[PDB]
Amino acid sequence: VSPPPPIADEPLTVNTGIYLIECYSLDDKAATFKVNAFLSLSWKDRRLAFDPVRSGVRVKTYEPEAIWIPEIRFVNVENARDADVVDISVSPDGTVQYLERFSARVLSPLDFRRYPFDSQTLHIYLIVRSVDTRNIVLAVDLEKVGKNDDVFLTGWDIESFTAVVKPANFALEDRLESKLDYQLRISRQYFSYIPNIILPMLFILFISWTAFWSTSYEANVTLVVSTLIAHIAFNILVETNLPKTPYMTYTGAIIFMIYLFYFVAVIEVTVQHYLKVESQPARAASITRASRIAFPVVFLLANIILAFLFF
Amino acid sequence: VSPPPPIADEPLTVNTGIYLIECYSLDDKAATFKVNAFLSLSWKDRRLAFDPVRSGVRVKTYEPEAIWIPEIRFVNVENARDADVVDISVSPDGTVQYLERFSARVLSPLDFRRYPFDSQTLHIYLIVRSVDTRNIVLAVDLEKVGKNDDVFLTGWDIESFTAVVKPANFALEDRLESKLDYQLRISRQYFSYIPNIILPMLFILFISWTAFWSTSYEANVTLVVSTLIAHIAFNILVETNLPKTPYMTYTGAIIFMIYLFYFVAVIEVTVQHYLKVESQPARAASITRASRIAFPVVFLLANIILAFLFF
Amino acid sequence: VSPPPPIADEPLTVNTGIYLIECYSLDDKAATFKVNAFLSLSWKDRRLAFDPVRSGVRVKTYEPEAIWIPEIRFVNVENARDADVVDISVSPDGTVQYLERFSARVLSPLDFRRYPFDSQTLHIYLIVRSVDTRNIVLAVDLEKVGKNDDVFLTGWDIESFTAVVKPANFALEDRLESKLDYQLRISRQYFSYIPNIILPMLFILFISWTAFWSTSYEANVTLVVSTLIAHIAFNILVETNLPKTPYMTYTGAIIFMIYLFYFVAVIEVTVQHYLKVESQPARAASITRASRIAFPVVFLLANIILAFLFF
Amino acid sequence: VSPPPPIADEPLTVNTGIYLIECYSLDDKAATFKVNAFLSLSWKDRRLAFDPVRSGVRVKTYEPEAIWIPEIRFVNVENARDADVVDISVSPDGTVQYLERFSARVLSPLDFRRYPFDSQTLHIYLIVRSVDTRNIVLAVDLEKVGKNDDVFLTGWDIESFTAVVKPANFALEDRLESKLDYQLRISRQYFSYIPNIILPMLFILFISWTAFWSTSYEANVTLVVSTLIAHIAFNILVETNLPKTPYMTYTGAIIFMIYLFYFVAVIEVTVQHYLKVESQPARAASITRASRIAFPVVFLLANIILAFLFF
Amino acid sequence: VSPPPPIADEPLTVNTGIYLIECYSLDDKAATFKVNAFLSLSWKDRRLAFDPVRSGVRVKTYEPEAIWIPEIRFVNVENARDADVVDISVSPDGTVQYLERFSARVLSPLDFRRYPFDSQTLHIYLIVRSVDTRNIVLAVDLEKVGKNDDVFLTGWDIESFTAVVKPANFALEDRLESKLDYQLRISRQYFSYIPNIILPMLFILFISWTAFWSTSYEANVTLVVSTLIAHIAFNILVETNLPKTPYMTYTGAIIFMIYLFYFVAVIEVTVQHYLKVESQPARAASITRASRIAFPVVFLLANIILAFLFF
Ligand SMILES: [Cl-]
Ligand SMILES: [Cl-]
Ligand SMILES: [Cl-]
Ligand SMILES: [Cl-]
Ligand SMILES: [Cl-]
Ligand SMILES: [Cl-]
Ligand SMILES: [Cl-]
Ligand code: NA
Ligand code: NA
Ligand code: NA
Ligand code: NA
Ligand code: NA
Ligand code: NA
């Protein structure tokens, strides 16, 4: 079966729609997510036109093998989609209405700069390659673009599912390709990060600062070194949920900066002890008293600077 | 093959049933579970009706390809089900009795608020899309809804498997859809959490409170900081078994609150030491003696408040 | 093709056999194991009977599509088995001899009460569903039940592979089902647990008891708290290899009990220090000397009680 | 299609060959590895014999469906192999030359006794089941047995790929089976284990022995207990890369033995402190000075004994 | 269908091209990566040649089954590729233009010597096996070799995608094989390793060196032993992201060397304490003051040596 013939030198328009049924398995590290949706297609093929009286049916149901179906693919998928044809209906002017339900693992990069207060635009690219007989162009039927109410993605808020109505028509290997961009807008549910990572991380840091109210070097060393190890544990935990990025993330910046605070706290505790041993506790007392104010103040200001640069 | 014609403008009723054979792989983080079941379907096709006297046979067995079968799908599945037709039997009046055995990975969100003392309602949504010739409606045959006795789900008690008998009939892409809700009620076996997480967590916390019976700052620092690290280990272990939720869980709330108890214990140990060094051990003794009562009392009351808010 | 007709109102007996070739991937947490085996089937089809003299051949080989084959399934499988027909041979009296090689992931619950000194009976349930024409019953051909010598399951000893010869004949969805139980008896190789978990766990516990030969509170606190943290590590390691059970396991009981020993050791170390500070070291010495005997004695007796209750 | 008829009562010889193209995914814990190879088969079918003069062609190419092909399988595979026929060529005398490219996951147990200085023989068992018409025997064509130069297995040295030329001919379910053993000899690249596990483990152990040059009980307790915890971490790391074995491994033996050294070091540190407190430091000094020599000497000799028993 | 006949004894040239659409899942440990691409093939079949005037059409479109297509495979793939034919076009002179879209998991070893400042050349080997009728040789059509702009690989910079135009023609099992090498050049984004592993590792090491400004043995032991444990954590973290190599990596070398620095620091802290106890603090002070300079100087020089040897 060959493609439908043109009335004039016009290309064949294949109207498309995607209705999301199930959205799942957003793998942040992998930049992959799985989708289960309806894919609707519509085009005009005058070779299948019919007169109802002779046929006895107002619309005909064809099997995919019986008629010409455009070879529609997704660009940003791991493998060819898992598709099951639901319905093929032909009107007697030859307007075909195709519907399939598919599942596919989609590849769409994520921007982690504001993690875990980040938002993303997941893309689903629909494509058709033109044939030698005719050029095929994709169009959006907005009445067939949407998502189920129950659609959920663990740890995310689903904002919108829309299509950029104008296709990207270009040449690939001396043939026209017509590409459509379907956009799924999402925003991370940051809530959990507060009681699970941010506050525990702040608690251990503030615990290290109690060394500024102690002259016991041995206790101070135990305080700063133990809390540092706990900070290392949180750093490792965070980087297991994140991919390696060629940029700094918001959380990554805070985590990194906190190491500097632990490093200077160890210097303070060392300087304090050295002075005490040298019989200079008055100078050591001045440094410890200043540290009581300096450490929280510099921590607060540096965080304001970070929040400002990132948001 | 076209759908059965109506006697009047009535829709086609397809009676359904699901009998669970094997239930497994409940992935809490993923909100997915796997199912292996019988799917029974029943409808009337007058074109298939026959006289038992003339034909000789009481029932006719058909191959799926030979007759019209409604296109039944699951809404909340990752991929199309793995199905194998078991039997197709037709009665003399044209009543078709269809039976298949299928396996599918179902997507059903879980409420973790009362974790690990939580109960869940897993859903299995059956759906049919209406055709241009006729409208198709789903119904429940209660005699064909059930589960095997041996059905088990590791770490859960299976309470019931029932169906909401009235379908959700709605329009999707200008066609009637008839959706049925099959509910699998389960309740978590909390037992194991007690000796494995709750009691070990309480033991380390109570170990930190021994610092209220010690004047040794160095030992106190070792006691509170070491037990805090062990609490961090348990917090990390718990959050690896749970997804990120936009709400607080019961366990999450207790775990978070325990950090505050460790934080105040560090303050007490610091205040005590500072006073001793300042030659004020009488004031320090009053604070330590009060802490011996205050810490368990505030811990007990705060837990009563939490249990009340969550249950 | 319809089922063979009865001589009288007798049911059709399908003789079965399972010969294990490869056994692998026993997932303790999941209650799943993978199997690769021969499935042999035998029944009489009089319609297929022939005269050896007239036909010339002693046996006739058929393709599955050419003759009636019973629809045999496994009850406790994740998905329908991966099967490949090896041979179909028909004898002159119409006795069909069917052989296939299959692979399946089997679901069989495990009893962890005596872990890691536990034994299990893995089940493989064969089933046939009766048809409207006739009732089908399963039987065991003991000469076709066995396993390869090389069959191994990492961390287990394979004891036996036998079949319960009498089927469980019952009604499921108003049709007779004939179910056969194939049993694979296994016993865990506990060896490794001794040098890897049990002895290291005992060593750290005995290390904590050295605090009963020390008056240094700071060293005692370091001894008991550090070894407790190591015990927490072993507890976490153990529970990662085990599912969450609504009962206590043998290892779980020992692990839990050891927490109580650490808890009382912390009390002893605290009481000892408090008394020393109060200028009562003679009373403290009596408690420490008693602890030297009490702790190993109570540990030994409590273990005898546990071993008795569990074995 | 039936098997080739015999000239006399001789069995049909199917010459075989396996040429490894890609070898990957050796899972030590699972005893599985994946293979991608050419499988060559050759046999004589007199019914396919032709005159080169009359036919014109020197060789005839057939599609698998057109001629009789022996049913060849692998014994120790998880599932049936993924195969794609490359070529079927028939010579004038009726000698068929079959070639396919396949991929399979092979199950072959490993001996971990000398880990990580162990060598293994991975097996690939080829098999044919005899038919009622004729008996089929397997043979090795050594010119069709080999491996690609680029063949690599991460962390291993590939030594050889050979076949045991004489098959194991036996009866399974009253039919002859002809089994061939293909052996892939490999030897572990131990290099990495030295800087990553062995030397770090020795460093922490030697760090614990510095307690023999200290009278500070508190520092000694910190030294031996901290290094023991680090040894526990290495023990856990090692057992995650290894399956549970019913025998001792070389590394397992060294790791276990090192626990005894830590245990005796804790006894020494305890005895030393007890004596000092009892005003017996002269006796304590004799024990500590002896320990300085005894610990490295006993460690060196015990290792010589272990290396001797294992190699 | 047989291969095209030669005009003379010349081999059949099959022009090839690969256009990368999606590149993903680079598993460093496994030496595997997944690819989604267009595979273009072109050859001349004179038997398919036609007159444009007589036939009417300028090009003829065929279904794969209808004409002779060369059997093209990939050498270094796990399984046979997942392919879907897009277009087959025949020009009047018989020049066939074939296009398919495929996905495959490719096996390509990586050189970790300069990790994480390493670059790699991923290989995709295209191959054709000659037939008995004719010899088949592969060629590169450079106009059909490329990659999509959007192509990305998390944690990597994609440099180029080119082909070695001259094939590796060799004999395998007495038949010509023509192999083409497609090279995907990538370079690791080392950025993240700096704040996540390198700087935290340097911070803990520098924290251990504060013991050179302290006479407190107990605090020194806590400082060096605690930071060593944190270094062990980072060593374990690094080796989980890397495979076991028979060579030293850059990071591996630095990590290993840092153990020696911790070992000598423990010796210094021990020697210092021993001397103090022996009433020789003047000699101990000389060693500690020298260590303050020696440790950073030797660390800096050893790193210059390492960087020089590795880059
Ligand atoms: Cl697609
Ligand atoms: Cl479905
Ligand atoms: Cl089955
Ligand atoms: Cl196979
Ligand atoms: Cl391929
Ligand atoms: Cl050659
Ligand atoms: Cl050739
Ligand atoms: Na078509
Ligand atoms: Na049908
Ligand atoms: Na059949
Ligand atoms: Na300590
Ligand atoms: Na065949
Ligand atoms: Na072809």
Numbering used by the authors:
A (entry chain B), B (entry chain C), C (entry chain D), D (entry chain E), E (entry chain A): 5 to 315
Paper passage:
The mutations E35Q, E35A, and E35M (the GlyR-position equivalent) display a significant increase in pH50, whereas E35K shows a weaker nonsignificant effect, and E35H appears to show the inverse phenotype with a marked decrease in pH50. Altogether, these data show that the loss of charge at the E35 position is important to the gain-of-function effect found. Mutants of E35 are unique in strongly increasing the proton sensitivity. Interestingly, the structures of the Wt GLIC, E35Q, and E35A at pH 4 show that the side chain of residue 35 is located in a hydrophobic environment bordered by the side chains of P113, L114, F116, F156, T158, and P247. There are no significant differences, measured as 5-fold over Wt, seen in the backbone Cα residues of any of the resolved structures, with the exception of E35A and E82Q. Interestingly, E35A also produces the greatest structural deviations around Y28 along with neighboring residues.
Each subunit consists of an extracellular domain (ECD), predominantly in a β-sandwich fold, and a transmembrane domain (TMD) composed of four helices, labeled M1–M4. However, the GLIC is a pH-gated channel, activated by lowering the pH, with a maximal activation at pH 4 and a pH50 around 5. We instead found that proton activation is a complex multiple loci mechanism, with the key contribution stemming from the coupling interface between the extracellular and transmembrane domain, with E35 acting as a key proton-sensing residue.
